[model samples]
Target chain A: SELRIILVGKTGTGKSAAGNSILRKQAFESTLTKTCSKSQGSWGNREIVIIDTPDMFSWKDHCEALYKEVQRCYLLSAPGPHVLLLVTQLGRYTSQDQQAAQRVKEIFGEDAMGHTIVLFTHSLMDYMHDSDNKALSKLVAACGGRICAFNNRAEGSNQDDQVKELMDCIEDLLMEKNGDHYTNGLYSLIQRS
Target chain B: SELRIILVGKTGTGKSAAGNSILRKQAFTLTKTCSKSQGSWGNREIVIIDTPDMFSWKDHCEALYKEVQRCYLLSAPGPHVLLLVTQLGRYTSQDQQAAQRVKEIFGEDAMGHTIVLFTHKGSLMDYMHDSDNKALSKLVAACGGRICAFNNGSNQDDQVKELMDCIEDLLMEKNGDHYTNGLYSLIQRS
Candidate 1:
């Protein structure tokens, strides 16, 4: 089975851009517009399928919509997603962010927490030779140390390093799952653990 | 006894301004901002309490603090009333605001001690009327036809009548013992 991943976040947070970066093409539309895009694509290896979701926090009737999206992701990757990539931006973590995270835990349950990886986009490292990796690391640790970072715009020579880091994070997650065995049954078993 | 009305709603909904309009004075600070004033009133028969925004995502950790404030107001020197100030232009009706208020009351178990008053910033007779009241009735039946209106710069005469009408309805409910006694008992028992 291929490694299934889902990108979930608030609107205008560069979710589609991240998807396009991973796909190595503008496969999903990314705009400043406050519209939701439900696009799915297979990138890198044919087995690796990535699902890009709409903004979760800004919906008028969000509770049911969030639940349905979670369910859809579950169904799309029957067995379960290898990783639930929670896409967020630097310095945007607020109480609303925590509320959204709490809702995710409630909807997807605890298993998703361990499997969840916080992907911080639009890093402050664009100009500097050395990025704010320390700040990024601290933020990830604050969010339970389940996080990774990538500059989606990094291309040509720098692309390999970014892709390698992403793959490393994914590989780490896969290894954890392989060690645990799928018996934990996605979120439910992981919650108990 | 004089009525003690508390204004509540989401941020930027003009709750403070509405409170000032009811009392016909700058009783509370009104700015194009969020969560500016709390517990400021003026010289009037009714004590208008302008509350800070209670539903901010950043301030959710202080929910217990907000609950204490609610309790203190309910047990204050006069009959407690709630001006559930919501912008009519924002939603189709006050249904969502009413629902959110109900949820907050249920969370604190203070529904019996509260009165639901909708503040229509626009022309009251034009935007909402008997049909809207009928719709709101189905949503908040315990409100007992206590819905009222207040424009952006509502005069004392305009609000006084509506305020009195609401207080009178509250008195009627109290006389009728229409409190959710069973529900309270059930919650206490559990």
Candidate 2:
């Protein structure tokens, strides 16, 4: 199965910028339009596919289009997606975020949700007045602990560390899936015996 | 357009029971299986559709199948009413529930499209004593403030009255759509 990762969030949430940051190149046209911009790129040794979705909650007609687009992504990804990076601004946590998370769960069943990780962009850690950690914690709690933080505009070193952490999280999830498969197979064997 | 109402909630949330109460008969099957059963009455003036529990968080495959089946109901006709069924005994709010509500709203395209009816099995006042009304309020707000309450199991008569009122309001709104008058010159003047 191919590794398909989607970047979803509201408009001006730096979805395109984050994709550029990950690919180390400007490949997507991030705009204010009510439509998604998709670009395929690679990061390090990982084959990364980024989908920058429109703000579907804002437009009624776009709702159907967004649904179709999401379905297309799922079909294209085949077996299932390796990860779903839910991108949102650092300071923009609201009830709508929870709604978006729900929308993801609906599109991708809860069984496929272990692969989801919430990524927050635009952190002002240099002049840190308040902690976005609390908001992040709330979001993680809301989504059943599938979340992580990332500062796309952080210093190069810090950004690299965040990316590494995200990669580690993804690896951990893959390992978990593999372990579950092994366990299920062993259980079946034991039952046969 | 005809009025369409769907009953939705978690498994064992008494969705079928609420439906039965509303129809004044046991028209729907209240089984543990994950399938939605519906029945209509009153000269076919009302169309009630009960949806299977989409409680995917509980590892219930039956519920998942039923939920997908309900999505197909959209092809028949758009639902004019949406009844969100919830058990009155449970007090604490679950994130999964909120998440599920969000998913349903998106799936149904429910903004200004449907009315939300909270089906309370027990007494509404008693249920509110333990559960935070804020959770329901927040959920309704996420769906654009189209909500009402119905305590069917406890106050059957009151629930029926409220349901009728909601339906009547819907009919009035639907009829008002036909009386619109705007000429090209009037549009240009504005």
Q: lDDT of all predictions, in order shown?
A: 0.52, 0.54
> Which candidate achieves the best DockQ against the true structure?
2
**Residue-wise lDDT of candidate 2 within B58-158, one digit each (tens)?**
33232343243334333133455556655554523443463354354345344344455565533544544565567655665655655556665456767
What DockQ does each prediction reach against the true complex?
A: 0.02, 0.03
- Candidate 2 docks with a DockQ of 0.03
- Chain A TM-score relative to the true structure, per candidate: 0.71, 0.70
* Model 1 ranges with Cα > 4 A deviation: A31-46, A57-64, A123-139, A142-144, A179-193, B1-136, B140-190
| Best-matching candidate per lDDT | 2
Q: In model 2 chain B, which range of ten residues has the least summed lDDT?
A: B178-187
Off by over 4 Å in 2: A36-38, A57-63, A111-113, A123-135, A142-162, A179-193, B1-190
Each candidate's root-mean-square deviation in Å?
15.4, 12.2
For candidate 1, lDDT tens digit of each residue in B52-150? 554322222223222323333342432256566555545333445544544443333344555545555335435544444454445355544455665
